[PDB]
CSV table of C-alpha atoms in Angstrom, one decimal:
chain,number,residue,atom,x,y,z
S,43,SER,CA,1.6,-3.0,-15.9
S,44,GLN,CA,5.6,-1.5,-15.8
S,45,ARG,CA,4.9,-2.7,-19.1
S,46,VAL,CA,2.0,-1.1,-20.7
S,47,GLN,CA,3.9,1.9,-18.6
S,48,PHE,CA,7.4,2.4,-20.0
S,49,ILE,CA,5.9,2.4,-24.1
S,50,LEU,CA,4.1,5.5,-23.1
S,51,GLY,CA,6.7,7.7,-21.3
S,52,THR,CA,8.7,7.4,-25.2
S,53,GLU,CA,5.9,7.9,-27.5
S,54,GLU,CA,6.5,10.6,-30.5
S,55,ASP,CA,3.8,13.4,-29.3
S,56,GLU,CA,4.3,17.2,-30.4
S,57,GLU,CA,2.6,20.1,-28.0
S,58,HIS,CA,1.5,16.7,-26.1
S,59,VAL,CA,4.7,18.0,-24.2
S,60,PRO,CA,4.7,18.1,-20.0
S,61,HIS,CA,4.9,20.7,-18.3
S,62,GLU,CA,4.6,21.5,-14.3
S,63,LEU,CA,1.8,21.3,-13.2
S,64,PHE,CA,-0.2,24.2,-10.4
S,65,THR,CA,-2.9,21.8,-8.5
S,66,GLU,CA,-5.5,23.4,-6.4
S,67,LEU,CA,-8.6,21.3,-4.5
S,68,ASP,CA,-12.1,23.0,-4.6
S,69,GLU,CA,-15.0,21.7,-2.7
S,70,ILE,CA,-18.5,22.6,-2.8
S,71,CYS,CA,-21.5,21.1,-1.4
S,72,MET,CA,-25.1,21.6,-1.5
S,78,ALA,CA,-23.5,27.7,-1.7
S,79,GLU,CA,-19.9,28.2,-3.4
S,80,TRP,CA,-16.7,26.7,-4.6
S,81,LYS,CA,-14.4,27.0,-2.0
S,82,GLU,CA,-10.3,26.9,-2.2
S,83,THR,CA,-9.3,24.3,-0.1
S,84,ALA,CA,-5.7,23.2,-0.7
S,85,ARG,CA,-2.6,24.3,-3.5
S,86,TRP,CA,0.0,21.8,-5.0
S,87,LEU,CA,3.5,23.0,-5.8
S,88,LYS,CA,5.9,19.6,-5.2
S,89,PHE,CA,4.3,20.9,-1.4
S,90,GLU,CA,1.6,20.7,-0.1
S,91,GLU,CA,-0.4,24.0,1.0
S,92,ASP,CA,-3.9,23.8,2.9
S,93,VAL,CA,-6.4,26.5,4.3
S,94,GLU,CA,-7.6,26.4,8.0
S,95,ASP,CA,-7.8,28.6,11.1
S,96,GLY,CA,-11.6,29.0,9.1
S,97,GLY,CA,-9.9,30.4,5.6
S,98,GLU,CA,-7.8,33.3,7.8
S,99,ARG,CA,-4.4,31.0,6.1
S,100,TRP,CA,-2.4,28.8,3.8
S,101,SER,CA,-0.6,26.5,6.6
S,102,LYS,CA,2.7,26.0,5.7
S,103,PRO,CA,4.2,24.2,3.2
S,104,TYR,CA,5.0,20.0,3.6
S,105,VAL,CA,5.4,17.1,1.7
S,106,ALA,CA,1.9,15.2,1.4
S,107,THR,CA,1.3,11.6,2.5
S,108,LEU,CA,-1.8,9.6,1.4
S,109,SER,CA,-4.5,7.3,2.9
S,110,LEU,CA,-4.1,4.1,0.0
S,111,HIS,CA,-7.6,3.7,0.7
S,112,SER,CA,-7.9,6.8,-0.8
S,113,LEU,CA,-5.7,6.2,-3.7
S,114,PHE,CA,-7.6,2.8,-4.4
S,115,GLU,CA,-11.1,4.7,-4.8
S,116,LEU,CA,-9.1,6.6,-7.0
S,117,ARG,CA,-8.2,3.8,-8.8
S,118,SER,CA,-11.7,2.9,-8.9
S,119,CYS,CA,-13.3,6.1,-9.9
S,120,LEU,CA,-10.5,5.8,-13.3
S,121,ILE,CA,-12.2,2.7,-13.9
S,122,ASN,CA,-15.7,3.7,-13.6
S,123,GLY,CA,-16.0,7.6,-14.4
S,124,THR,CA,-15.8,9.7,-17.1
S,125,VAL,CA,-12.9,9.8,-18.9
S,126,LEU,CA,-11.6,12.5,-21.8
S,127,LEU,CA,-8.9,13.2,-23.5
S,128,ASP,CA,-7.8,15.8,-25.7
S,129,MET,CA,-11.1,17.5,-25.1
S,130,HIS,CA,-11.5,20.3,-27.8
S,131,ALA,CA,-13.0,23.3,-25.3
S,132,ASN,CA,-12.6,26.2,-24.7
S,133,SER,CA,-14.2,27.2,-21.7
S,134,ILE,CA,-16.3,25.4,-18.4
S,135,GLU,CA,-20.4,25.3,-20.1
S,136,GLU,CA,-18.4,24.0,-22.4
S,137,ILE,CA,-16.8,21.2,-20.3
S,138,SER,CA,-19.1,20.3,-18.0
S,139,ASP,CA,-22.1,19.8,-20.9
S,140,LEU,CA,-19.8,17.5,-22.5
S,141,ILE,CA,-19.7,15.4,-19.5
S,142,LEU,CA,-23.0,15.3,-18.7
S,143,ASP,CA,-23.9,14.9,-22.1
S,144,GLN,CA,-22.2,11.0,-22.3
S,145,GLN,CA,-25.1,8.9,-23.5
S,146,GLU,CA,-24.0,6.8,-20.3
S,147,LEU,CA,-23.7,9.4,-17.8
S,148,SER,CA,-27.0,10.8,-18.4
S,149,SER,CA,-28.2,7.8,-18.4
S,150,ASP,CA,-27.4,7.5,-14.6
S,151,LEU,CA,-29.2,11.3,-13.9
S,152,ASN,CA,-32.3,12.4,-13.7
S,153,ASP,CA,-33.0,15.2,-15.9
S,154,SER,CA,-33.8,17.0,-12.6
S,155,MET,CA,-30.3,15.6,-11.1
S,156,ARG,CA,-28.8,17.2,-14.3
S,157,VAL,CA,-29.7,20.5,-13.9
S,158,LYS,CA,-28.4,20.9,-10.7
S,159,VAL,CA,-25.3,19.7,-11.7
S,160,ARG,CA,-24.4,21.9,-14.5
S,161,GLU,CA,-25.6,24.5,-11.9
S,162,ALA,CA,-22.7,23.6,-9.3
S,163,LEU,CA,-20.3,22.8,-11.8
S,164,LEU,CA,-20.7,26.6,-13.0
S,165,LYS,CA,-20.9,28.4,-9.6
S,166,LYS,CA,-18.1,30.8,-9.4
S,167,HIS,CA,-14.9,29.4,-6.9
S,168,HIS,CA,-14.3,31.7,-4.3
S,169,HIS,CA,-9.9,31.9,-3.8
S,170,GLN,CA,-7.7,32.3,-0.6
S,171,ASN,CA,-7.5,35.5,-1.4
S,241,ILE,CA,7.0,29.8,-9.3
S,242,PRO,CA,7.1,28.3,-13.0
S,243,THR,CA,6.4,30.5,-16.7
S,244,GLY,CA,5.7,26.8,-18.3
S,245,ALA,CA,2.8,25.4,-16.0
S,246,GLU,CA,-0.6,24.9,-17.2
S,247,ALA,CA,-2.6,23.8,-13.7
S,248,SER,CA,-5.1,21.4,-12.8
S,249,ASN,CA,-8.3,21.5,-11.4
S,250,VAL,CA,-9.7,19.3,-8.8
S,251,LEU,CA,-13.3,20.0,-8.3
S,252,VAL,CA,-15.0,17.7,-5.6
S,253,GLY,CA,-17.7,17.9,-3.1
S,254,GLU,CA,-21.9,16.8,-2.3
S,255,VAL,CA,-24.8,17.4,-3.6
S,256,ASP,CA,-28.1,16.8,-2.3
S,257,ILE,CA,-30.1,15.3,-5.1
S,258,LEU,CA,-27.4,12.8,-6.2
S,259,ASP,CA,-28.0,9.1,-5.7
S,260,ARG,CA,-24.7,7.8,-6.9
S,261,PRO,CA,-21.3,9.7,-7.3
S,262,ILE,CA,-20.4,11.3,-10.8
S,263,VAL,CA,-16.5,11.3,-11.9
S,264,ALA,CA,-14.7,12.4,-14.9
S,265,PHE,CA,-10.6,13.0,-15.3
S,266,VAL,CA,-10.9,15.6,-18.8
S,267,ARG,CA,-7.6,16.7,-20.9
S,268,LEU,CA,-7.9,19.7,-23.1
S,269,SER,CA,-5.9,19.8,-26.1
S,270,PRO,CA,-4.7,23.4,-26.0
S,271,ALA,CA,-4.5,24.2,-21.8
S,272,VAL,CA,-7.4,26.8,-21.6
S,273,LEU,CA,-7.7,29.9,-19.6
S,274,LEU,CA,-10.8,28.8,-17.7
S,275,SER,CA,-11.8,32.3,-16.7
S,276,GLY,CA,-11.9,33.2,-13.3
S,277,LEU,CA,-11.3,29.6,-12.2
S,278,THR,CA,-8.3,29.0,-10.6
S,279,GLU,CA,-6.5,31.6,-7.4
S,280,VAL,CA,-3.2,32.6,-10.5
S,281,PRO,CA,-4.6,33.3,-13.7
S,282,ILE,CA,-2.5,29.9,-15.4
S,283,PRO,CA,-4.1,27.9,-18.3
S,284,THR,CA,-6.2,24.5,-17.6
S,285,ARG,CA,-4.8,21.0,-18.4
S,286,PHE,CA,-6.3,19.2,-16.4
S,287,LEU,CA,-10.2,19.0,-14.4
S,288,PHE,CA,-10.7,16.2,-12.4
S,289,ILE,CA,-14.5,16.2,-10.8
S,290,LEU,CA,-16.1,14.2,-7.9
S,291,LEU,CA,-19.4,14.8,-7.2
S,292,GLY,CA,-21.7,12.8,-4.5
S,293,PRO,CA,-24.2,12.7,-2.4
S,294,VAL,CA,-24.1,14.0,1.0
S,295,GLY,CA,-21.9,12.1,3.5
S,296,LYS,CA,-19.6,11.8,1.4
S,297,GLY,CA,-17.2,15.5,2.0
S,298,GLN,CA,-14.0,13.9,3.8
S,299,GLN,CA,-13.7,11.0,1.1
S,300,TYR,CA,-13.8,13.2,-1.6
S,301,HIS,CA,-11.6,15.5,0.1
S,302,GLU,CA,-9.2,12.4,0.0
S,303,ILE,CA,-9.7,11.3,-3.0
S,304,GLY,CA,-8.7,14.8,-4.4
S,305,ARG,CA,-6.0,14.6,-2.2
S,306,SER,CA,-4.6,11.5,-4.0
S,307,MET,CA,-5.7,13.0,-7.4
S,308,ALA,CA,-3.3,16.1,-6.3
S,309,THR,CA,-0.7,14.4,-4.8
S,310,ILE,CA,0.0,11.8,-7.0
S,311,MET,CA,0.1,14.7,-10.0
S,312,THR,CA,2.8,16.2,-8.2
S,313,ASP,CA,4.8,12.1,-9.4
S,314,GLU,CA,7.5,13.1,-11.9
S,315,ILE,CA,6.7,9.6,-14.0
S,316,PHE,CA,2.8,9.9,-12.9
S,317,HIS,CA,2.3,12.8,-14.2
S,318,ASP,CA,4.4,12.5,-17.7
S,319,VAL,CA,1.4,9.4,-18.3
S,320,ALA,CA,-1.3,11.8,-17.8
S,321,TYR,CA,0.2,14.1,-20.8
S,322,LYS,CA,0.4,11.8,-23.1
S,323,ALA,CA,-2.0,8.9,-22.2
S,324,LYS,CA,-4.0,8.1,-24.8
S,325,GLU,CA,-6.8,6.0,-23.1
S,326,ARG,CA,-8.1,5.1,-20.1
S,327,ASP,CA,-6.4,1.5,-19.6
S,328,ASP,CA,-3.0,4.4,-20.0
S,329,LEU,CA,-4.2,6.0,-16.5
S,330,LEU,CA,-4.3,3.0,-14.6
S,331,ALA,CA,-0.9,1.5,-16.0
S,332,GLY,CA,0.1,5.0,-14.2
S,333,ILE,CA,-1.7,4.3,-11.3
S,334,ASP,CA,-1.0,0.8,-11.3
S,335,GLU,CA,2.9,1.4,-11.8
S,336,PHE,CA,2.7,4.4,-8.9
S,337,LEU,CA,1.4,1.7,-6.4
S,338,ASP,CA,3.6,-0.4,-7.1
S,339,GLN,CA,7.0,2.5,-5.8
S,340,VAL,CA,5.8,3.6,-3.0
S,341,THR,CA,6.6,3.1,0.7
S,342,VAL,CA,4.2,3.3,2.8
S,343,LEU,CA,4.5,4.1,6.9
S,344,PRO,CA,2.5,0.9,9.4
V,42,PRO,CA,-17.4,-5.8,4.4
V,43,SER,CA,-13.1,-6.7,5.3
V,44,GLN,CA,-13.8,-4.9,8.8
V,45,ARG,CA,-16.7,-7.1,9.0
V,46,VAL,CA,-14.6,-10.5,9.2
V,47,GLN,CA,-12.2,-7.9,12.2
V,48,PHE,CA,-14.7,-6.9,13.5
V,49,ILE,CA,-16.1,-10.4,14.4
V,50,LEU,CA,-12.0,-11.8,15.0
V,51,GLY,CA,-11.5,-9.1,17.7
V,52,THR,CA,-13.8,-9.5,20.5
V,53,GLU,CA,-14.5,-14.1,20.2
V,54,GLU,CA,-14.0,-16.2,23.2
V,55,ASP,CA,-10.4,-18.0,23.4
V,56,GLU,CA,-8.7,-19.1,25.9
V,57,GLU,CA,-4.5,-19.3,26.0
V,58,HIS,CA,-5.9,-18.0,22.5
V,59,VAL,CA,-5.0,-14.2,24.3
V,60,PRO,CA,-2.9,-12.1,22.6
V,61,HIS,CA,1.2,-12.0,23.2
V,62,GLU,CA,3.6,-9.1,22.4
V,63,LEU,CA,5.8,-10.3,20.0
V,64,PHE,CA,9.5,-10.7,19.7
V,65,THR,CA,10.7,-10.7,16.2
V,66,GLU,CA,13.5,-12.5,14.7
V,67,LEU,CA,14.3,-12.4,10.9
V,68,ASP,CA,16.6,-14.8,8.8
V,69,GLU,CA,18.1,-15.7,5.9
V,70,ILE,CA,19.7,-18.7,4.5
V,71,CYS,CA,21.1,-18.8,0.7
V,72,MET,CA,21.6,-22.4,-0.4
V,73,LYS,CA,23.9,-22.6,-4.0
V,74,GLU,CA,25.5,-26.0,-4.7
V,75,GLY,CA,29.1,-27.5,-3.1
V,76,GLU,CA,28.5,-24.4,-0.9
V,77,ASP,CA,27.8,-25.3,2.4
V,78,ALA,CA,25.4,-22.5,3.7
V,79,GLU,CA,23.3,-22.0,7.0
V,80,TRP,CA,21.0,-18.8,8.5
V,81,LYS,CA,21.8,-16.1,9.5
V,82,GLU,CA,19.8,-13.1,11.4
V,83,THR,CA,19.4,-10.2,10.0
V,84,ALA,CA,16.8,-8.1,11.6
V,85,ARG,CA,14.7,-8.3,15.2
V,86,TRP,CA,11.7,-6.5,16.2
V,87,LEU,CA,10.2,-5.2,19.2
V,88,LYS,CA,7.6,-2.2,17.8
V,89,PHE,CA,11.3,-1.1,16.3
V,90,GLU,CA,12.6,-2.6,14.0
V,91,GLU,CA,17.0,-2.6,14.1
V,92,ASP,CA,18.9,-4.7,11.1
V,93,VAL,CA,22.3,-6.6,10.7
V,94,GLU,CA,24.7,-3.9,8.5
V,95,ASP,CA,28.5,-3.5,7.3
V,96,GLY,CA,28.2,-6.6,6.8
V,97,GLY,CA,27.3,-8.3,10.2
V,98,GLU,CA,29.5,-6.1,12.2
V,99,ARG,CA,27.1,-4.4,13.7
V,100,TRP,CA,22.7,-3.7,15.3
V,101,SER,CA,21.4,-0.3,13.8
V,102,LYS,CA,19.7,2.2,16.1
V,103,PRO,CA,16.8,1.2,16.5
V,104,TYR,CA,14.1,2.9,14.1
V,105,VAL,CA,10.5,3.4,13.1
V,106,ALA,CA,10.1,0.6,10.1
V,107,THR,CA,8.5,1.2,6.8
V,108,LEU,CA,7.8,-1.0,3.5
V,109,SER,CA,7.7,-1.5,0.0
V,110,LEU,CA,3.9,-1.8,-0.8
V,111,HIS,CA,4.6,-4.2,-3.8
V,112,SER,CA,6.0,-6.6,-1.2
V,113,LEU,CA,2.9,-6.6,0.7
V,114,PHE,CA,1.0,-7.5,-2.0
V,115,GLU,CA,3.4,-10.1,-2.5
V,116,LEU,CA,2.8,-11.3,1.1
V,117,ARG,CA,-1.1,-11.4,0.8
V,118,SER,CA,0.6,-13.3,-2.5
V,119,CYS,CA,1.4,-15.9,0.1
V,120,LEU,CA,-1.1,-16.4,2.2
V,121,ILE,CA,-3.7,-16.7,-0.6
V,122,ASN,CA,-1.4,-19.5,-1.9
V,123,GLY,CA,0.2,-20.9,0.8
V,124,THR,CA,0.8,-23.7,3.4
V,125,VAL,CA,-1.2,-21.7,6.6
V,126,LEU,CA,-0.5,-24.4,9.6
V,127,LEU,CA,-2.9,-22.4,12.8
V,128,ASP,CA,-2.5,-23.7,16.2
V,129,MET,CA,-0.5,-26.2,14.5
V,130,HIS,CA,0.8,-29.3,18.0
V,131,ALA,CA,4.5,-29.8,17.6
V,132,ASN,CA,7.3,-29.1,19.8
V,133,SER,CA,10.7,-29.1,17.4
V,134,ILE,CA,12.0,-27.9,14.8
V,135,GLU,CA,11.9,-31.8,12.6
V,136,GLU,CA,8.7,-31.7,13.5
V,137,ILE,CA,7.5,-28.8,12.1
V,138,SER,CA,9.2,-28.6,8.6
V,139,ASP,CA,7.7,-32.2,8.4
V,140,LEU,CA,3.9,-31.1,8.9
V,141,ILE,CA,4.7,-28.4,6.8
V,142,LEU,CA,5.9,-30.8,4.2
V,143,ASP,CA,3.2,-33.7,4.3
V,144,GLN,CA,0.8,-30.6,3.7
V,145,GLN,CA,-1.1,-33.5,0.5
V,146,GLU,CA,-0.8,-30.2,-1.6
V,147,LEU,CA,2.2,-28.7,-0.4
V,148,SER,CA,4.4,-32.4,-1.4
V,149,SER,CA,2.0,-33.0,-4.8
V,150,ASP,CA,4.5,-30.2,-6.2
V,151,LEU,CA,7.7,-31.5,-4.6
V,152,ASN,CA,10.5,-33.4,-6.2
V,153,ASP,CA,11.8,-36.4,-3.9
V,154,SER,CA,15.1,-34.3,-4.3
V,155,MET,CA,13.2,-30.8,-3.7
V,156,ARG,CA,12.0,-32.2,-0.4
V,157,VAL,CA,15.2,-33.2,0.8
V,158,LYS,CA,17.4,-30.0,0.1
V,159,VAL,CA,14.3,-28.5,1.7
V,160,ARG,CA,14.7,-30.2,4.6
V,161,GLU,CA,17.6,-30.1,5.6
V,162,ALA,CA,17.7,-26.6,4.8
V,163,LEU,CA,15.4,-25.5,7.7
V,164,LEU,CA,17.5,-27.6,10.4
V,165,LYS,CA,20.2,-25.7,9.7
V,166,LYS,CA,21.9,-23.8,12.3
V,167,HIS,CA,21.2,-20.6,12.9
V,168,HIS,CA,23.5,-17.9,13.7
V,169,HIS,CA,22.1,-14.6,15.5
V,170,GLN,CA,24.2,-11.8,15.8
V,171,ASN,CA,25.8,-11.8,19.6
V,172,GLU,CA,28.9,-13.1,18.0
V,173,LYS,CA,27.2,-16.2,17.8
V,232,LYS,CA,24.6,-17.2,29.0
V,233,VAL,CA,25.3,-14.8,26.1
V,234,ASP,CA,22.3,-12.3,25.1
V,235,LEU,CA,22.0,-9.2,25.8
V,236,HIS,CA,21.0,-5.9,27.1
V,237,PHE,CA,18.0,-6.1,24.7
V,238,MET,CA,16.7,-8.8,27.2
V,239,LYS,CA,15.8,-6.6,29.6
V,240,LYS,CA,14.0,-4.0,26.9
V,241,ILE,CA,11.6,-7.3,26.6
V,242,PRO,CA,8.0,-7.3,28.1
V,243,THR,CA,8.0,-10.2,30.5
V,244,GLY,CA,4.9,-13.0,29.2
V,245,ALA,CA,6.0,-11.6,25.6
V,246,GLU,CA,6.9,-14.4,22.6
V,247,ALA,CA,8.7,-14.7,19.5
V,248,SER,CA,7.9,-14.9,15.7
V,249,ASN,CA,10.6,-16.3,13.4
V,250,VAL,CA,10.4,-15.4,9.6
V,251,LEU,CA,12.7,-17.6,7.8
V,252,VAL,CA,13.2,-16.0,4.1
V,253,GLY,CA,15.7,-17.7,1.9
V,254,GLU,CA,16.6,-19.3,-1.0
V,255,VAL,CA,17.5,-22.9,-2.5
V,256,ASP,CA,19.3,-23.6,-5.8
V,257,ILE,CA,17.0,-26.4,-6.1
V,258,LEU,CA,13.7,-25.3,-6.5
V,259,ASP,CA,11.5,-23.7,-9.4
V,260,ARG,CA,8.8,-22.6,-7.5
V,261,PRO,CA,8.2,-20.7,-4.5
V,262,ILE,CA,7.0,-22.3,-0.6
V,263,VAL,CA,5.4,-20.5,1.8
V,264,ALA,CA,3.3,-21.2,5.0
V,265,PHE,CA,2.8,-19.2,8.0
V,266,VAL,CA,2.1,-21.0,11.1
V,267,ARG,CA,0.3,-20.8,14.7
V,268,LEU,CA,1.7,-23.0,17.5
V,269,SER,CA,-0.5,-24.1,20.0
V,270,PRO,CA,1.5,-24.0,22.8
V,271,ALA,CA,4.5,-21.8,22.3
V,272,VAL,CA,7.5,-23.7,22.4
V,273,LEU,CA,11.2,-23.0,22.9
V,274,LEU,CA,12.5,-23.8,20.4
V,275,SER,CA,16.1,-25.1,21.1
V,276,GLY,CA,18.7,-22.5,18.9
V,277,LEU,CA,16.6,-20.7,16.4
V,278,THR,CA,15.8,-17.3,18.7
V,279,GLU,CA,18.3,-15.3,19.8
V,280,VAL,CA,16.8,-15.1,23.0
V,281,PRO,CA,15.6,-17.4,24.8
V,282,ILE,CA,11.0,-16.8,24.2
V,283,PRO,CA,8.3,-19.4,23.4
V,284,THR,CA,8.1,-18.9,20.2
V,285,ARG,CA,4.4,-18.6,18.4
V,286,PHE,CA,4.8,-18.2,14.9
V,287,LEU,CA,6.7,-19.5,12.3
V,288,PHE,CA,6.8,-17.4,8.5
V,289,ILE,CA,8.3,-19.3,6.1
V,290,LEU,CA,9.5,-18.0,2.3
V,291,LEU,CA,11.9,-20.2,0.1
V,292,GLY,CA,12.0,-20.0,-3.7
V,293,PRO,CA,15.1,-20.0,-6.3
V,294,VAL,CA,18.5,-18.4,-6.6
V,295,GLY,CA,18.1,-15.0,-7.3
V,296,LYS,CA,14.6,-13.8,-5.4
V,297,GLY,CA,17.0,-13.6,-2.3
V,298,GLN,CA,16.2,-9.1,-1.7
V,299,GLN,CA,12.8,-9.3,-2.9
V,300,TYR,CA,11.7,-12.4,-0.2
V,301,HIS,CA,13.7,-10.0,2.3
V,302,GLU,CA,11.2,-7.3,1.4
V,303,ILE,CA,8.5,-9.9,2.6
V,304,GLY,CA,10.4,-10.7,5.4
V,305,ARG,CA,10.4,-8.0,6.7
V,306,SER,CA,6.9,-7.0,6.2
V,307,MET,CA,5.5,-10.1,8.3
V,308,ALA,CA,7.9,-9.0,10.7
V,309,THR,CA,6.8,-5.8,10.6
V,310,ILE,CA,3.0,-6.4,9.9
V,311,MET,CA,3.6,-8.3,13.2
V,312,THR,CA,4.1,-5.0,15.2
V,313,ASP,CA,0.7,-3.8,13.9
V,314,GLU,CA,-1.8,-4.0,17.5
V,315,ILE,CA,-4.4,-5.5,16.0
V,316,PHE,CA,-2.9,-7.5,13.3
V,317,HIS,CA,-1.3,-9.1,15.7
V,318,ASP,CA,-4.5,-9.5,17.5
V,319,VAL,CA,-6.4,-10.9,14.5
V,320,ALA,CA,-2.8,-13.5,13.8
V,321,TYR,CA,-3.6,-14.9,17.6
V,322,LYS,CA,-7.1,-15.9,17.0
V,323,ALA,CA,-7.3,-16.2,13.0
V,324,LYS,CA,-9.1,-19.6,12.5
V,325,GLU,CA,-8.5,-19.9,8.9
V,326,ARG,CA,-7.3,-18.6,6.3
V,327,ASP,CA,-8.9,-16.4,5.4
V,328,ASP,CA,-9.3,-14.6,8.6
V,329,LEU,CA,-5.8,-13.5,7.7
V,330,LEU,CA,-6.5,-12.0,4.8
V,331,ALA,CA,-8.8,-9.8,5.9
V,332,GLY,CA,-6.5,-9.4,9.2
V,333,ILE,CA,-3.7,-8.0,5.7
V,334,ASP,CA,-6.5,-6.3,3.9
V,335,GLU,CA,-7.4,-3.7,7.1
V,336,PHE,CA,-3.9,-2.8,7.7
V,337,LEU,CA,-4.1,-1.6,3.7
V,338,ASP,CA,-6.2,0.3,4.3
V,339,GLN,CA,-5.6,2.3,6.5
V,340,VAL,CA,-1.4,2.9,6.1
V,341,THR,CA,0.1,5.6,4.7
V,342,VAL,CA,1.2,6.1,1.4
V,343,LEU,CA,5.2,7.5,1.5
V,344,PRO,CA,5.4,9.6,-2.5
């Protein structure tokens, strides 16, 4: 699994070049999207009712939530080098998966697309940076969670989506039923935090298929130290 | 769940199976052909960890242990595939080793020559840090009813597979010359394998010792009735650790 790993990091690729990442975590509960955290090697969280950004700190993760993230990449939608130039397009491509629309009602799809297209309220530094939008939260009508990892082919400035006008390269979407909100917050944190890992973040840029990503996670998990 | 099994354990009626606080010592060996070799204490725990450093000259300042995730999975793997002998009634280190080596499974993997070397290794003296009654100011720091846990890892030239054993004694026993401090031994962990696995084993040893400082896991260790209770223990622990990227 470091076998699978090394083959990826050293593939010939043009435009698939890695950039530095700004990562924003927004959350929803069905109501609008609310920015709750952001990354840039260090993490800051929204607090005191939205009044304030915390001081920057070095993120730590619950192993539990990393496993959940891993499970998400095994069972979820993974769309790489998606050529979409807007959020409508992205959401429809996800929802129109011949498998992912076979888990949802007609009624369930309506609510979810409506959610992905809700406005993003924000709290309101590298040159060639791209953005990664981690969008997680609850939707009342769901009975299953909905997971998607997307990598756009040209990065695209998705209007009003990121707190800073930066082109999006990655999106992670985790939507699920009520009572899963805190779990999703940490899964979201884990996706964001793991993208700050230098080696894993390269894998995400160069991955050609779902298993490549799992090799990335597994290699990460194999190298970290834990605090009892 | 894996806290299903867990919650069931934490609350079973058991007498003398009562949990105690733990002193844990990590000793390491290396058996290279022709070269004589004994056990050397390399670390100890009492909630905090201290390591032997600078070539055996010195103890470290006490610190809060951290573990490699890798070595914890290996440890889990050790408990899945290794010898698990709970409530062993043995009153000496000879007796304990024979019981381990006489598992109808664990002796169907070994040469006659391989059993000989390994028994010889287990019976080597244990060098402790105290230049060597003659003990410490450390002994004062030890809770009154505490029992000890001995983590023994290392290399044996003649092995080609690793050898793992987790043992819990039924009465705890003051195994002569084994612990650096006269405390009855309750737990033993043994990991012996071929040369070149030495540093890997050191971290599995640290993981074993450290996981015994865990309040919940150490309760499971005292009350486990079977190998599966231990793994639920390990899995619960893993589910709750925090990771430092």
